[PDB]
Symmetry: C2
Subunit: 232 residues, 2 copies
């Protein structure tokens, strides 16, 4: 069904950072002519909304007296709004975002323009099911950490071979006395222990989530894509 | 209080893998004389339990009517059956474990013996709050990916420095002993195409427990302040 395909598409969207009036949110959205699926998080809680075209028609009529248009045209505009600002927030937007909470609900409010008139849309988000949190956050973040650890082991392997080649020159007479500061042979235990002491505090810093969005989305999409394809 | 301290200690705890006749679980637990806090996951859902001395006293008496010592001694035995088994799965266990789902709840059952008598415990778990899920999984797992990415970038910088030293040594020895110069983008591309499918598979959560817990612990430690 159309709703299944929104949730499917949503799983393979990357996360964007979203500047709001007061705070910020992480956001991923997937929009077609049939509706949208949205996932939003503030790194404490996760919220979700799914809508079809009836709901688009209904709510566009509630929020907008000054114009009307087919549901798909409204869905198209929302995509135009959310798309460029996802990729970077150095894009001249002219659209504004705010949100407020009411128990297990988050309302994300948008003001933009359409047909040279003001346009309003509200996303009514409810706390995401544990299955959606698991699917979009826990499993992929776990898969990513494993993949990054494998990258690390592979680079350690490459380093030992570089050192072996360096040893090969040394043993054949290339240098007889140490005459300059060169790198020390790579030792993974001391690399790790120095990293945790010197680099870990700052390297693991989540912050407002922007590091995640700017550094790790290629890997994230590659990982969520792999599970979709495995889960068939 | 009692519970805030138990929750704090649970957060410092690593994740462990737990075998059970039917399936397996990811588990972490923190037991003192004041009770315990438990987190459990099958990778689709996350369950939580905390107990105090009142609950331990009530449940231990109910389950073991001909057993007489206070809660502290019971929590002491639970810890002796549990913690060694969570440190190594290959370690001879005096207990049997099973697991049952009743509605939205998870019940981990323990069967043991103490002093010629049978010893029984049930850990009754509810779905963990979004806040525990984020604290014990989402934020640390995010921390860990960022940290490991920094590692990769550091190892890339070191590989390139070694390459500069190698290219200096040719100011010539056997060609088959010469490595290819390191190029990061081409390393990443190759890895994503050839390695990523297998490298990211989580299976039953066992690789995450066997490979990543030292880093898991470093990251949760860091976030607390």
């Amino acid at each position: 069904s159309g709703m299944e395909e929104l949730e499917q598409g949503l799983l393979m969207q990357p996360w964007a950072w979203l500047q709001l009036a007061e705070n910020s949110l992480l956001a991923k959205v997937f929009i077609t002519k049939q509706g949208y699926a949205l996932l939003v998080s503030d790194l404490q809680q996760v919220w979700h909304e799914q809508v079809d075209t009836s709901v688009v028609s209904q709510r566009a009529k509630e929020l907008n007296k000054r114009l009307t248009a087919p549901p798909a045209a409204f869905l198209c505009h929302l995509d135009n709004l959310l798309r460029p600002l996802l990729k970077d927030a150095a894009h001249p937007s002219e659209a504004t975002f705010s949100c407020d909470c009411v128990a297990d609900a988050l309302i994300l409010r948008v003001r933009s323009e359409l047909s040279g008139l003001p346009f309003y849309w509200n996303f009514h988000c409810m706390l995401a099911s544990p299955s959606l949190v698991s699917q979009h956050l826990i499993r992929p973040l776990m898969g990513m950490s494993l993949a990054l650890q494998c990258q690390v082991r592979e680079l350690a392997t490459l380093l030992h071979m570089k050192d072996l080649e360096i040893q090969d020159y040394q043993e054949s007479g290339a240098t007889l006395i140490r005459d300059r500061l060169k790198t020390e042979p790579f030792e993974e235990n001391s690399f790790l222990e120095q990293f945790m002491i010197e680099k870990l505090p700052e390297a693991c810093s989540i912050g407002d989530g922007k590091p995640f969005v700017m550094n790790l989305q290629d890997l994230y999409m590659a990982v969520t894509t792999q599970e979709v394809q495995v889960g068939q």
